[PDB]
Design a protein around this ligand. Sequence first.
Ligand code: FAD
Ligand code: FAD
Ligand code: FAD
Ligand code: FAD
Lengths: 324, 322
Amino acid sequence: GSHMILKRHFDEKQAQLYDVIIAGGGAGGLSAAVYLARYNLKVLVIEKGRGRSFWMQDLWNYVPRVVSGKELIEGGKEMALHYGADWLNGFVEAVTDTGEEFQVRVKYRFKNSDYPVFRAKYLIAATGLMDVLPQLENMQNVYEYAGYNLHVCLICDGYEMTNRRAALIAGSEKAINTAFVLNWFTPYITVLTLGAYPVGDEMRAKLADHGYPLIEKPIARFLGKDHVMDGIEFADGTSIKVDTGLISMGSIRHDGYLLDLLTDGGDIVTEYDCRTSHPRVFALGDLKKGLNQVSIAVADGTLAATAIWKEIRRASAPRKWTAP
Amino acid sequence: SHMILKRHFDEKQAQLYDVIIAGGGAGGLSAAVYLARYNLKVLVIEKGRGRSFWMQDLWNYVPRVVSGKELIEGGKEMALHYGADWLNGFVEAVTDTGEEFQVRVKYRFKNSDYPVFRAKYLIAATGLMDVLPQLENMQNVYEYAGYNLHVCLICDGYEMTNRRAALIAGSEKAINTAFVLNWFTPYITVLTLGAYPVGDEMRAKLADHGYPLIEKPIARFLGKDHVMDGIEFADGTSIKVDTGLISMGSIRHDGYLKNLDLTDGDIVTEYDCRTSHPRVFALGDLKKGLNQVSIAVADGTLAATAIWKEIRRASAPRKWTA
Ligand SMILES: Cc1cc2nc3c(=O)[nH]c(=O)nc-3n(C[C@H](O)[C@H](O)[C@H](O)COP(=O)(O)OP(=O)(O)OC[C@H]3O[C@@H](n4cnc5c(N)ncnc54)[C@H](O)[C@@H]3O)c2cc1C
Ligand SMILES: Cc1cc2nc3c(=O)[nH]c(=O)nc-3n(C[C@H](O)[C@H](O)[C@H](O)COP(=O)(O)OP(=O)(O)OC[C@H]3O[C@@H](n4cnc5c(N)ncnc54)[C@H](O)[C@@H]3O)c2cc1C
Ligand SMILES: Cc1cc2nc3c(=O)[nH]c(=O)nc-3n(C[C@H](O)[C@H](O)[C@H](O)COP(=O)(O)OP(=O)(O)OC[C@H]3O[C@@H](n4cnc5c(N)ncnc54)[C@H](O)[C@@H]3O)c2cc1C
Ligand SMILES: Cc1cc2nc3c(=O)[nH]c(=O)nc-3n(C[C@H](O)[C@H](O)[C@H](O)COP(=O)(O)OP(=O)(O)OC[C@H]3O[C@@H](n4cnc5c(N)ncnc54)[C@H](O)[C@@H]3O)c2cc1C
């Protein structure tokens, strides 16, 4: 269908068996939905909202136009519907494999939620992940600057950080090593560990050799005006002046609904097809091993949708021109 | 972030770029913005009137449906904004000196200058061009090629769904896409243009499927306002079709790569898009894999990052000395 699913259609759609069900309606999931809808296959996209792409203010490196994250989802959503994809505003809880097909439970609505289950021969895991954010009592203070000039991905915003006073909020001793990659863009790095883990002397000597100050105080407030951060204030009232920052605190994986198996080294392993260890499920974008960009996520959906279309097509009966 | 004119040839020819990108299409432009955004020196060289330029509607590239011209125009602007250099020229030849590449470019169509630029890395992103049916009045083919007379099944299969379709095959082997196109529409008419003999094996297979086989040459494509509605053959007869698919092969834009060596139909690459020849990457339509804009853009991201990682890891750490 070419319409969003509301309360009435659950009885119909639960009986109906989709060719593929897409979990997550972001960059990769929408691309896959558009391709699958364009291949005349039954596809349902399930999007919870407020995803990682939604908080992206400026998509800098996705040709041909610079768009916001909300514009990206809105345009791709519109496109998927236009081509015949079904879209549902819900959260995917779990999946059951019966040998053939998948059974996908979805929490509909935040409170007093319906738990409709949908059927599909294939599944596409395209739920991405969410970046960890420093924790303050007023998170609106963190939100005012996060995603603007307080960055979460080095490749996405490194260009705008060039030769600027930068603060690296590292969530672990390993995460401090991003200073030695961030320094490519700016050597004016201040490493902030938030008083969370003790730093080894090896790394302490390395930061000193490079001249990067190490501040192990907790954070209290981000200082800025009109979404442009200009400083960081610590618990004791003191502060530092920074023109930009990079959060390197790890990522949260939206892989609850995923089954077991599925080999990984922190992220699911996939073939050039984006086919995971399970033959019938494909992993897209940030969930799979590889770059975490919109370009590669969009391409992943193209790869997965085509591999699925080839398998179904090669198993379908030829459509002949029968007598009229 | 400037476009090269007459003055800048001598200066930029002396400069060693970090990478040169051959072809300013989907994949090349994506690689350009990433490299420029890695604060690396990159030069893009675009001839113009490429395959993507003739694409009228980009259907399956989120978030917006744009024309191929809009795609190149936007990506070009972006690359320039971020510091990439753009040259309007044709890449003629490439030499690997062991420590760098020298790329000669024909500048201007007539009375042309032949500046040769330098770079440590090279990205081959010149794609290919689809073969078209040959009529005396080629404007009649261009009138409909790219609108509803298609060249790529994956791109426009959706618009061909359950419509009277003509498959213009350039060879008996090419006729086999009818058995893939039938997924979208079974109302397929196979046209051989009377250029090659069809075997009875294939002749019987088309009959079993009910796909008419017409072995007459073509004379004119019938339509009005870029929407084809039929085909007229040499003998005066005609058929009515609402759409068609051209399957006559492709010519590669890989002339300048003759000197280099590049395992091959298409160039083979790793996941990085790295070719066999060290320090050169092949993107998009030149490499083995799907021929789509989405995967071409992603190819540029992979190559640009792989180059950045190699240089970054080879550069001295930038320490804070104040
Ligand atoms: C501030 C910021 C700026 C960025 N800038 C750039 C940039 O310039 N260039 C770039 O390439 N990348 C950028 N990124 C990262 C980029 O957004 C991701 O790499 C990209 O979106 C990955 O796409 P995806 O489809 O894998 O995941 P997403 O785009 O996050 O899509 C996942 C979607 O699935 C939904 N979802 C998740 N779990 C579930 C569930 N269980 N049920 C239902 N729905 C679910 C989410 O709501 C989300 O919308 C940026 C990120 C941030 C935070
Ligand atoms: C750069 C950046 C900027 C950000 N800015 C903001 C901001 O300004 N404001 C903000 O609030 N957050 C922001 N975030 C995200 C923030 O950090 C938290 O991740 C978010 O606020 C918490 O989401 P949630 O409570 O919906 O958790 P979720 O994991 O989305 O929800 C938890 C549970 O709720 C249920 N559920 C979720 N969605 C649905 C649905 N559609 N239907 C039914 N059930 C559902 C599921 O069962 C799930 O287990 C930002 C993140 C980044 C990286
Ligand atoms: C009518 C039509 C419709 C299409 N629709 C779709 C679609 O809906 N979706 C989709 O995914 N794909 C579509 N395609 C295919 C799509 O255009 C390609 O897959 C995509 O553009 C690949 O880009 P590329 O960078 O590999 O090559 P391109 O971007 O096509 O071209 C590379 C560039 O290099 C330049 N170049 C070549 N040789 C030289 C040289 N010697 N010197 C200088 N410059 C050179 C060319 O001029 C060109 O601009 C369509 C193609 C056509 C013809
Ligand atoms: C769907 C579709 C629709 C098409 N529609 C059209 C159409 O409407 N009109 C049309 O003309 N073609 C169209 N084409 C392509 C067409 O078939 C021919 O490829 C093209 O028209 C002529 O190419 P060319 O002879 O210039 O070859 P090219 O290789 O482009 O040119 C050959 C020579 O010109 C020189 N040269 C080219 N560009 C430059 C430059 N910027 N600077 C210096 N020297 C240069 C080079 O030195 C080269 O040796 C279409 C193709 C497809 C697939």
